[PDB]
Design a binder for this molecule. Sequence first.
Ligand code: 65P
Ligand code: 65P
Lengths: 139, 139
Amino acid sequence: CSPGIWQLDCTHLEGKVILVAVHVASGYIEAEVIPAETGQETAYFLLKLAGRWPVKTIHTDNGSNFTSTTVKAACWWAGIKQGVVESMNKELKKIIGQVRDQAEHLKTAVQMAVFIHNKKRKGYSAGERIVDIIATDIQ
Amino acid sequence: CSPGIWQLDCTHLEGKVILVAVHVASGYIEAEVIPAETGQETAYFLLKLAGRWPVKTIHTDNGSNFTSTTVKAACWWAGIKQGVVESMNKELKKIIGQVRDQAEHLKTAVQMAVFIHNKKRKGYSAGERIVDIIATDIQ
Ligand SMILES: Cc1nc2c(ccn2Cc2ccc(F)c(F)c2)c(-c2ccc3c(c2C)CCCO3)c1[C@H](OC(C)(C)C)C(=O)O
Ligand SMILES: Cc1nc2c(ccn2Cc2ccc(F)c(F)c2)c(-c2ccc3c(c2C)CCCO3)c1[C@H](OC(C)(C)C)C(=O)O
């Protein structure tokens, strides 16, 4: 849909938390392994994300994720308001499992899975589609 | 110059290390605050960066930064080889100083400075130029 929409959710693996951001229009992913599911971690992740892409609106499958004072502060400062996402998360979880034995740390496997996901042609890749969608929206 | 060239360097502030990546052709920046200047931190940062952008070659002002087994492993797996950068780092350091009192954590000020830097029109911004350069290179 719109090029400024991102969906953010956390998933749990090996007793750790993976924050996954999906650019809904392209299927492109950004992810980080965080110690715990806290408002401060979500707020910091949003500031990083908003500095890289033109983030207009955020969606989530857990609304209570965005109630903290810290998350509201990050969205205020950055000027952020509010099958694809389910499929992109499914694909990422599958890829982590496929590459997991190749690294010691879960965070390393997660970044290998993000790379594989973003570079896979579906014909363009999610990495190619996001830059095309954003560049076209500017011009 | 070429759209796949990035320059990576560390800078020191308040007893912490900031890893700064500059996309040479656009002036776009990605940065993270790391505990210490280690090969494992550089390797992990490179895996994240390479998953987001088409990273072909890496430059640095300190060649010894890339000698560790971990950095060479990240470049091998991701298929990475090897006034603008000086100006982009100068501007970032100036912006951190300007916004520093607005946040408790240096990492928060750093991400606010990256956002401000990438969104500032110079007429396009570094954030707009990187997506235009990469989208044009694909098509
Ligand atoms: C933790 C870690 N160590 C690594 C390496 C590579 C060498 N070493 C040293 C080493 C030496 C002897 C060993 F017996 C041993 F098991 C590992 C990667 C690493 C770095 C980059 C990378 C990959 C690996 C495995 C896999 C493909 C994608 O890119 C690691 C790695 O951790 C950091 C990325 C944090 C450095 C990991 O989680 O295994
Ligand atoms: C650590 C931190 N705490 C924050 C907040 C916001 C509210 N609080 C709670 C709070 C309550 C009462 C206070 F007296 C007090 F000082 C702070 C930001 C924060 C979050 C987002 C953000 C900004 C701030 C200050 C500045 C503009 C860009 O976006 C922080 C913040 O740390 C995290 C980003 C890790 C949450 C910080 O470093 O100050």
